[PDB]
């Protein structure tokens, strides 16, 4: 069936759209080649529509059926709870898109009578009606990139009342079921330090390792109605409250498998028969589907002693080599099996014999040295997109601050320490905003974090070595330096000068600011300050941080204020 059908009505914006990076003094202190930075808009939506619209031909086999039964046997151990309306309301982001039915996210969070009444009516409708397709809005996503242009990605999501109901029925399922089913292969259970430990240990556990990343082209579009019902067959193995069983059944048939698409003007846009990017089950569903297809494909390809690491549509496989020619042929056999399963590749996969050459979750393993000279593996990535987005976020107030998430997740990197920490701490200190909570995303969930709490967060996630790494690899240094020349970012010597300046100001303030000066900027001086465990670090409640993926799932994970 066709992933989409279109009526001809346009994918429309709801307000004015900015595509060019503004010429602003603060963003220009970070990145001078402003014309290289752009944001996608609804203007390129028709280009994306062409790419995502295609017929799917899916052929299942015994390997697929065998893996599915094994996955279902593991899912059968799960007991999932139905969330109360209050619990589901507290998981709604404060700036989540308002309902078309006269209430918004603030009303949901405050448990307003109108919001609660409407949520109750939507819930009852899911219990009573098993068939009426649920309306969804389609919008072009606004995302920032560096040139060499990508067309806008499309986001498809149901009304706020429906999203609250999805949490009630499925938040516990999507949070617990993936690790029960996939075990150590489930990527979202790991902090970046745990992910690098898993990759390194997996790589070293093979006699002669071979690894590869597998990129599916337009994954959400490749997801069939059969795949979405298969995913539901796994959810149904949970012990569930009867109302949750009915809501999952109704949501699968009315929303997850497909439905009508409406633009921002209220016009009928078309019909979807593939994964919606903006529902609670997107991450969990994509992860399970990718794992199922890939596990079965490994068996079809006769790949030996396979270990997979899956995060949504992102897949990395580490296995035992059978020799270069044999591995090349087995990888073609894997690709052929994935294609039959309706998961064809974007770029054909390449066998890799060096762990640092694999790019998975847009990241690669690299090595640096701690204060004692001991080798420390850590995850890095090309800094082009993080820097382009940090420049955008400096010039415009954006709902999500990717710079903050990048500092948290890539804290040990040369680029996050020398550039992002230096730039943002300098600006925030000049604005007396170091203590102001900002929103960022970790594994798709929204968190409200104060920049002053970064030292303890980083220590918990990455260890104290995140503040002591040095002797970065020549390859990593060259990649960063080349990216700075390309984007017109001042060189690392300028960043060291700026860091010494902000470090002195932070130390002079005492309190939490001085902890930031001591730990975050110890790299900038020869006269190192002693770094001991931060007391606040052991007291941090990081429950929920690295449990599951929630991209597109409208999840907020910071504490709710009592009423
Ligand atoms: N490209 C992907 C990435 C993922 C998993 N993943 C995410 C993620 O965005 O989910 C982040 C991440 C980076 C910055 C801010 N916040 C974050 O969560 C991240 C960082 C490392 Cl080191 C490893 C994996 C990571 C899943 C699917 N496709």
From Swiss-Prot:
The modification Phosphoserine is found at residues 29, 42. Residues 209-327 form the RdRp catalytic domain. It is a single-pass type IV membrane protein. It is found in: Host cytoplasm; Host endoplasmic reticulum membrane. The N-terminus is phosphorylated by host PRK2/PKN2. Activity is up-regulated by PRK2/PKN2-mediated phosphorylation. It comes from the Viruses. It catalyses: RNA(n) + a ribonucleoside 5'-triphosphate = RNA(n+1) + diphosphate. Its cofactor is Mg(2+). Coiled coil: none annotated. Binds 2 magnesium ion that constitute a dinuclear catalytic metal center. Changing residue 361 to R: In strain: Isolate pCV-J4L2S. RNA-dependent RNA polymerase that performs primer-template recognition and RNA synthesis during viral replication. Initiates RNA transcription/replication at a flavin adenine dinucleotide (FAD), resulting in a 5'- FAD cap on viral RNAs. In this way, recognition of viral 5' RNA by host pattern recognition receptors can be bypassed, thereby evading activation of antiviral pathways. Homooligomer. Interacts with non-structural protein 5A. Interacts with host VAPB. Interacts with host PRK2/PKN2. Interacts with host HNRNPA1 and SEPT6; these interactions facilitate viral replication. Part of the replication complex composed of NS2, NS3, NS4A, NS4B, NS5A and the RNA-directed RNA polymerase. This is RNA-directed RNA polymerase. The chain holds residues 2420 to 2987 of 3010 of the full protein.
């Amino acid at each position: 069936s066709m992933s989409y059908t279109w009526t001809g009505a346009l994918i429309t914006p709801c307000a004015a759209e900015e595509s060019k990076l503004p010429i602003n003094p603060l963003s220009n202190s970070l990145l001078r080649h402003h014309n290289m930075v752009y944001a996608t808009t609804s203007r390129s939506a028709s280009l994306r529509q062409k790419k995502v619209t295609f017929d799917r031909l899916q052929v299942l086999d015994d390997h697929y059926r065998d893996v599915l039964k094994e996955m279902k046997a593991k899912a059968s151990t799960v007991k999932a709870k139905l969330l109360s309306i209050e619990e589901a309301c507290k998981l709604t982001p404060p700036h989540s898109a308002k309902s078309k039915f006269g209430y918004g996210a603030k009303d949901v969070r405050n448990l307003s009578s109108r919001a609660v009444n409407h949520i109750r009516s939507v819930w009852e409708d899911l219990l009573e009606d098993t068939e009426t397709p649920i309306d969804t809005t389609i919008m072009a996503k606004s995302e920032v990139f560096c040139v060499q242009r990508k067309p806008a990605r499309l986001i498809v999501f149901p009304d706020l009342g429906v999203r609250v109901c999805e949490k009630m029925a499925l938040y516990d399922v999507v949070s617990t079921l993936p690790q029960a089913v996939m075990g150590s292969s489930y990527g979202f259970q790991y902090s970046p330090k745990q992910r690098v430990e898993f990759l390194v240990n997996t790589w070293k556990s093979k006699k002669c390792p071979m690894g590869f990343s597998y990129d599916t082209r337009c994954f959400d579009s490749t997801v069939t109605e059969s795949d979405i019902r298969v995913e539901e067959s796994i959810y149904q193995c949970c012990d569930l409250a009867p109302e949750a069983r009915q809501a999952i059944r109704s949501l699968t048939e009315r929303l997850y498998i497909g439905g009508p698409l409406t633009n921002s003007k209220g016009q009928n846009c078309g019909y979807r028969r593939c994964r919606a990017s903006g529902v609670l089950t997107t991450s969990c569903g994509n992860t399970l589907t990718c794992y199922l297809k890939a596990t079965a494909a490994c068996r079809a390809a006769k790949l030996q002693d396979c270990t997979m690491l899956v995060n949504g549509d992102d897949l990395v496989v580490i296995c035992e080599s059978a020799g270069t020619q044999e591995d090349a042929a087995a990888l073609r056999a894997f690709t052929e099996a994935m294609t039959r399963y309706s998961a064809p590749p974007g770029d054909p996969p390449q066998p890799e014999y060096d762990l640092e050459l694999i790019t998975s979750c847009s990241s690669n393993v690299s090595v640096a040295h701690d204060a004692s000279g001991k080798r420390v593996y850590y995850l890095t990535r090309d800094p082009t997109t993080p820097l382009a987005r940090a420049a955008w976020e400096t010039a415009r107030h954006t709902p999500i601050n990717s710079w903050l998430g990048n500092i948290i997740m890539y804290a040990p990197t040369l680029w996050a320490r020398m550039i992002l920490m230096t730039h943002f701490f300098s600006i925030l200190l000049a604005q007396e905003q170091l203590g102001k909570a900002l929103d960022c995303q970790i594994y798709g969930a929204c968190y409200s974090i104060e920049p002053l709490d970064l030292p303890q967060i980083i220590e918990r996630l990455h260890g104290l070595s995140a503040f002591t790494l040095h002797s970065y690899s020549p390859g990593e240094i060259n990649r960063v330096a080349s990216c700075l020349r390309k984007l017109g970012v001042p060189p690392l010597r300028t960043w060291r000068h700026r860091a010494r300046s902000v470090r002195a100001k932070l130390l002079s303030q005492g309190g939490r600011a001085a902890i930031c000066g001591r730990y975050l900027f110890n790299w900038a001086v020869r006269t190192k300050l002693k770094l001991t465990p931060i007391p606040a670090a052991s007291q941090l409640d990081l429950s929920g941080w690295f449990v599951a993926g929630y991209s597109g799932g409208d999840i907020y994970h910071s504490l709710s204020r009592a009423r």
